[PDB]
Amino acid sequence: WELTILHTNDVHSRLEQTSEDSSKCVDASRCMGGVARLFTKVQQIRRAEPNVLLLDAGDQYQGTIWFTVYKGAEVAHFMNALRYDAMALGNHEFDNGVEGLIEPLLKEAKFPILSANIKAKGPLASQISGLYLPYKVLPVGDEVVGIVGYTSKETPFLSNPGTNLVFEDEITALQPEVDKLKTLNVNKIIALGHSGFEMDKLIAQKVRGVDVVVGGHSNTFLYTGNPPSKEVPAGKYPFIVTSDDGRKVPVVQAYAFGKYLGYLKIEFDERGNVISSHGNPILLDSSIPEDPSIKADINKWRIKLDDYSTQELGKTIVYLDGSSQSCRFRECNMGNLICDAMINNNLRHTDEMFWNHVSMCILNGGGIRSPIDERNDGTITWENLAAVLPFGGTFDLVQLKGSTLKKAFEHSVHRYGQSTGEFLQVGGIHVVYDLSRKPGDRVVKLDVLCTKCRVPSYDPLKMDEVYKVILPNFLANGGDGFQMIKDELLRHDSGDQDINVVSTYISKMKVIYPAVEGRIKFS
Ligand SMILES: COC(=O)c1ccc(CO/N=c2\ccn([C@@H]3O[C@H](COP(=O)(O)CP(=O)(O)O)[C@@H](O)[C@H]3O)c(=O)n2C)cc1
Ligand SMILES: [Zn+2]
Ligand SMILES: [Zn+2]
């Protein structure tokens, strides 16, 4: 018995077709993804295959002005229109709190929403009871397929789930629900969840009874053969994990931003064992046309969003590299732009006096969520900025010891090479790293633009000197494991809204040209 699993993860409010780097589509003839083009590929498959399951492994929430305005109503509407069969809750579905998930998404979704490891205590229990489930048993033809859900254990450290939601260990929560399914003679079990390629491999290995693991969160690109675009595969598709009980368990992911539709065809025997599986993510490129009905529906919704693009903030003569393969691995000019906006807006505050000379900046590269293209004649709109900075935080001012900053720089590359968001973009700092050294002893040079000097210049960081640094409030409060900043700072003040800072800066410069200058080097 064959089943075709179609799957998406980390769409991140990319309802419209986007450029190759998933930023605002300018050249419509070369644009990819979007729910309308996804509809066309799903329909084509459903026409040709009788046993199809369309599944989302989370993080449809957050990413573009679609989310800023509709707060999740666009997720329910366009997922309902695509006829999704099931969706696992991601960390980003709690970005607007529990009420921001319950009221627009859970109560309007037609498909089941799953998570077996989220438990609800207090008065939330009665309200959210049944609005999401640990599993769902689905009829597929004349057979039945069980889907168990999971959600990142780290969600309270990345989102706003509140204090009436406990996030259990994935494996501990999943095993009893998989066992319950097997006692109900549900022999075909998909584990659909949002925890990352690493936890997915672990779930395939340790959770007996699981046949397939469909995942997300790590934005993993898996491919068998020649990749169709710039994404480099982190392994074959499907990735095969040999479980402890000898079974071969396929693990799949479909990159992110609606760019690819994950496609896995599975051949099962009558006892629900996997004989074989094969597939590849389908690159949703311009060859596949956008479904006219979905496009005209997206366009009707798009009328409300057109007042953000209507206002041009400024112009850029350069590509604003806000990608994850640059901003989490090396110096990217988008981190440089954000830090120069942070420092400049603060310095124009002639009302204060304590932070009126701050010239140092640190910025978590994972906080930079999108690049910005320059082929619109340089034109930068609020809509573009909204995708680079969707968390709506502030730019806080902090007083740190040199040893505290040195520890933050060690932390910045302690587990380098995993697309980890803790890699820092700097301003008024020149750091050199030697990755061929033990984690914690990789900073080989660190110079900062001094302040106890009349004519600044980058001078060696002193371990016991005090520095005034501007950074996102997220870092100021210990986010990304930057607990040393929260534990060791000497003063912490709130600043202006991150998007209003960068927006005001660009309008004042009128033409920006951030570049890679040697702020971060490797030895
Ligand atoms: C309206 O407000 C929100 O939407 C709102 C959402 C959240 C908060 C609290 O969390 N704030 C964070 C959380 C994470 N990060 C960054 O994201 C990285 C994780 O990204 P990925 O590895 O790509 C996994 P993902 O797909 O789930 O994002 C972290 O490593 C870190 O570098 C942040 O910068 N911030 C500011 C507050 C508000
Ligand atoms: Zn995501
Ligand atoms: Zn996530």
Curated annotation (Swiss-Prot):
Its EC number is 3.1.3.35, 3.1.3.5, 3.1.3.89, 3.1.3.91. IMP binds at residues 328, 364, 369, 391, 474, 480. One of its GO terms (biological process) is calcium ion homeostasis. Disulfide bonds join 25-31, 327-332, 339-361, 450-453. InterPro entries: 5'-Nucleotdase_C, 5'-Nucleotdase_C_sf, 5'-Nucleotdase_CS, 5_nucleotidase/apyrase, Calcineurin-like_PHP_ApaH, Metallo-depent_PP-like. AMP binds at residues 328, 364, 369, 391, 474, 480. It catalyses: a ribonucleoside 5'-phosphate + H2O = a ribonucleoside + phosphate; a 2'-deoxyribonucleoside 5'-phosphate + H2O = a 2'-deoxyribonucleoside + phosphate; dTMP + H2O = thymidine + phosphate; CMP + H2O = cytidine + phosphate. Its main location: membrane. It comes from the Eukaryota. It is linked to Calcification of joints and arteries: A condition characterized by adult-onset calcification of the lower extremity arteries, including the iliac, femoral and tibial arteries, and hand and foot capsule joints. Age of onset has been reported as early as the second decade of life, usually involving intense joint pain or calcification in the hands. This is 5'-nucleotidase. The lineage of its organism: Eukaryota, Metazoa, Chordata, Craniata, Vertebrata.
